[PDB]
A paper describes a structure:
Here, we analyzed banked samples from this study to investigate the evolution of the memory B cell response at the monoclonal level over a period of 1.5 years in rhesus macaques receiving the AS03-adjuvanted subunit vaccine. More importantly, we isolated some extremely potent bnAbs (21B6, 27A12, 25F9 and 20A7) after the primary vaccination with an AS03-adjuvanted nanoparticle immunogen. Furthermore, we determined crystal structures of mAbs (25F9, 20A7, and 21B6) and their mode of binding to the RBD of SARS-CoV-2, as well as one structure of 21B6 complexed with the RBD of SARS-CoV-2 BA.2, at resolutions of 3.05, 2.58, 1.75 and 2.30 Å, respectively.
25F9 targets one side of the RBD with some overlap with the conserved CR3022 site, where approximately 80% of the 25F9 epitope is buried by the heavy chain. Heavy chain (H) and light chain (L) CDRs H2, H3, L1, L3, and light chain framework region 3 (LFR3) interact with RBD. 25F9 binding would clash with the human angiotensin converting enzyme 2 (ACE2), which explains its high potency. 25F9 VH F54 inserts into a hydrophobic pocket in the RBD and stacks with aromatic residues RBD-Y365, F377, Y369, P384, and aliphatic residue L387. 25F9-VH K52 side chain and VH A52c backbone carbonyl hydrogen bond with RBD-Y369 side-chain hydroxyl and C379 backbone amide, respectively. The CDR H3 and light chain of 25F9 also form polar and hydrophobic interactions with the RBD. Here we show that the broad-and-potent neutralizing antibodies 25F9 and 20A7 also target this RBS-D/CR3022 site and neutralize all tested SARS-CoV-2 variants as well as other SARS-like viruses. 25F9 completely prevented weight loss from SARS-CoV-2 (MA10), SARS-CoV (MA15), and SHC014 MA15 infection. 25F9 completely abrogated viral replication in all mice at 4 dpi. 25F9 protected against the SARS-CoV-2 BA.1 and other sarbecoviruses equally effectively as it protected against the SARS-CoV-2 (MA10), highlighting its potential as a broad and potent sarbecovirus prophylactic antibody.
Author numbering:
A (entry chain A): 333 to 527
B (entry chain B): 1 to 52, 52A, 52B, 52C, 53 to 82, 82A, 82B, 82C, ...
C (entry chain C): 2 to 9, 11 to 27, 27A, 27B, 27C, 28 to 95, 95A, 96 to 169, ...
């Protein structure tokens, strides 16, 4: 019983970087997605694999909230079957994803004069990420034929890069907060249902 | 040839209802947001409303001047967006356009978007007008010195109406302005002639309005009035 | 919020013309990519600029766009007689959703600019006896054909009952139009005067009448 605690995920003071995206398990509560939709003015609210009309009537074993911060024009990469730096090295969704992606502009919170360098993203990687994979490795990336031996030289790049979010920029470069809800339905008592 | 075509317009009575339909041709109609934008005769473009896709959580949003009176729905099986108009007012007379929102397709954020495909547009006229005679009032001059005489023809129907001065004797200086379209559906216009000040005491000036469609003839003098 | 646009923008054949769109910090000062559209006489609008900078394929490269702070600029180089149309700018706002500009009428100058000659009339006593009152402002002899109208009772603006016509070509290639502000006799007697103010090419011509002009 009792409403699902979405507050600590969406209203949270701090959000993680895209390469270290945060995950939260939600269960044993009733989810009212109309209240969540009308709780604020979101920029994107798109549900994949499930009809939004039939949302307050379903039941699932669990739900998982993945929260992070990206830039505007990268929001297109948070979707099944998308490519790009974020969709390959930071956060990956399966082709058969079932859930809902929500995103909203956060320039008033994640933009500082001179840029915000606290937010990073992975730039180089040897292989793509599997769906729902989280990589926090900081090993030196080998670019050339010479071995790196964990020394920051040339052809030996650090795999993470700063965003530098700045307020006066256009909305394409402005920081956006992204929360992805994934629905898990197993042979188990469904602990999340509509009203 | 990617197309959007609107249909179902015409003349509606004040307070009536009408449904406009916009049909697509040649693209994935279920993947685009659809916008209705209207334009009053001789005015700018006003956004009326928009509707999202099936997989988007939300409801259509409308303009504050039409909120609670206009409804926007869609049928994907027939590729048609419907705009229903109820309790129509005379202020709604305009050309309506149906368009699609790209940029929302590519960037998926409300802050970025544009309209790339537009329909020809459909005219909607809300009026209860009928053949009616005009009202003619003379316009006497002030001390604004020559002087400007005039006469006003208000609330007439239909177009057009002809006005002369001194039964066609006076033509030098006569200027007749184009008619105005009022929200009531009736028209109005004014005619002005510049005449010498010294001749005002001897020569008489009369404006003659002949509304043929109503068997109307009105001849009125321009008399400087006082208190 | 209706983003403010100049009523006209003129230029000799071959000039560089600029159109400005001014918005609030809520729409153009917050990024919110601006779009520029073109409407020829009698046709539907056509997209010209999107994301403040990008040109769709097929659109001529003589059209450029820029954004500075809370304003946007559309620049047309190599002015042509075929570019004479109306231009609009559209932006999204967090509260008022999609907004369009007031529209700019581009004219290619074939004659030097001319100022309007405005004549104002008072409500006639006959109409007053008919429990009606009309003001009637006449604008004429202005080129190019794009003006803005404003009405004042005493010194405060009036907006209820305003009818503004369109500029029609005169016999000598200049333009004329009219505006009508009807009002009740009680409103006429409750104000010491009424003024008609018309703005043309950044300069205002105004006239005033009074109910005490016996
Ligand atoms: C994130 O936090 C904000 C506030 O910090 C939450 O806004 C809250 O929204 C609820 C919606 O039910 C408001 O409840 C009602 O609001 C009216 C005023 O609008 C009030 O008169 C009622 O007594 C009732 O409280 C609540 O007031 C509002 N918070 C505040 C401080 O007014 C928002 O819902 C949170 N987001 C999520 C996803 O939970």
């Amino acid at each position: 019983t009792n409403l699902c605690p979405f507050g600590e995920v969406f209203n949270a003071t701090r959000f993680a970087s895209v390469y270290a995206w945060n995950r939260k398990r939600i269960s044993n509560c009733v989810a009212d997605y109309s209240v969540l939709y009308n709780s604020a003015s979101f920029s994107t609210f798109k549900c994949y694999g499930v009809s939004p009309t039939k949302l307050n009537d379903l039941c699932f074993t669990n739900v998982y909230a993945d929260s992070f911060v990206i830039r505007g024009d990268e929001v297109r990469q948070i979707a099944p079957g998308q490519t790009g730096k974020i969709a390959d090295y930071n956060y990956k969704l399966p082709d058969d994803f079932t859930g809902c992606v929500i995103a909203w502009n956060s320039n008033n919170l994640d933009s500082k004069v001179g840029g915000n360098y606290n937010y990073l993203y992975r730039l180089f990687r040897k292989s793509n990420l599997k769906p729902f994979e989280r990589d926090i490795s900081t090993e030196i990336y080998q670019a050339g034929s010479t071995p790196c031996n964990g020394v920051e030289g040339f052809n030996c790049y650090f795999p993470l890069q700063s965003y530098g979010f700045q307020p006066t920029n256009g909305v394409g470069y402005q920081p956006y907060r992204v929360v992805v809800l994934s629905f898990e339905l197993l042979h188990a008592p469904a602990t999340v249902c509509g009203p | 040839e990617v197309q959007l075509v609107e249909s179902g317009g015409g003349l509606v009575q004040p307070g009536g209802s009408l449904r406009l339909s916009c049909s697509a041709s040649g693209f994935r109609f279920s993947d685009y947001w659809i916008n209705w934008v209207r334009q009053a005769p001789g005015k700018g473009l006003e956004w009326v409303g928009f509707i999202k896709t099936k997989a988007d959580f939300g409801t259509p949003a409308y303009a504050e001047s039409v909120k609670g009176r206009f409804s926007i729905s869609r049928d994907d099986s027939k590729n048609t967006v419907y705009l229903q108009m109820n309790s129509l007012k005379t202020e709604d007379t305009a050309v309506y356009y149906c368009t699609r929102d790209r940029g929302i397709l590519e960037w998926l954020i409300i802050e970025a978007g544009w309209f790339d495909v537009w329909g020809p547009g459909v005219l909607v006229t809300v009026s209860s007008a009928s053949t009616k005679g005009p009202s003619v009032f003379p316009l006497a001059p002030s001390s604004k010195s020559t002087a400007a005489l005039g006469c006003l023809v208000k609330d007439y129907f239909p177009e057009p109406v002809t006005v002369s001065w001194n039964s066609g004797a006076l033509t030098s200086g006569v200027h007749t302005f184009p008619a105005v379209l009022q929200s009531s559906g009736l028209y109005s216009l004014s005619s002005v002639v510049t005449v010498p000040s010294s001749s005002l005491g001897t020569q008489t000036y009369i404006c003659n309005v002949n509304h043929k469609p109503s068997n109307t003839k009105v001849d009125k003098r321009v008399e400087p009035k006082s208190c | 919020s209706v983003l403010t646009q100049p009523p006209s923008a003129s230029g000799a054949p071959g000039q560089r013309v600029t159109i400005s769109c001014t918005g609030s910090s809520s729409n153009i000062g917050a990024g919110h990519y601006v779009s520029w559209y073109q409407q020829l006489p009698g046709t539907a609008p056509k997209l010209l600029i999107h994301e403040n900078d990008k040109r769709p394929s097929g659109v001529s490269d003589r059209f450029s766009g820029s954004r500075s702070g809370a304003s946007a600029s559309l620049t047309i180089t190599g002015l042509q007689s075929g570019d004479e149309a109306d231009y609009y700018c559209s932006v999204w706002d967090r509260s008022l959703n999609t907004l369009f500009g007031g529209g700019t009428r581009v004219t290619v100058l074939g004659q030097p600019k001319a100022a309007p000659s405005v004549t104002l009339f008072p409500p006639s006593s006959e109409e007053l006896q008919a429990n009606k009152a009309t003001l009637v402002c006449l604008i004429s002899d202005f080129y190019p054909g794009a003006v803005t109208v404003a009405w004042k009772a005493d010194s405060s603006p009036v907006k209820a009952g305003v009818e503004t016509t369109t500029p029609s070509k005169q016999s000598n290639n200049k333009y004329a139009a009219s505006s009508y502000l009807s009002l009740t006799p009680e409103q006429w007697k409750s104000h010491r005067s009424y003024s008609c103010q018309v703005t043309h090419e950044g300069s205002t011509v105004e006239k005033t009448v009074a109910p005490t002009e016996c």
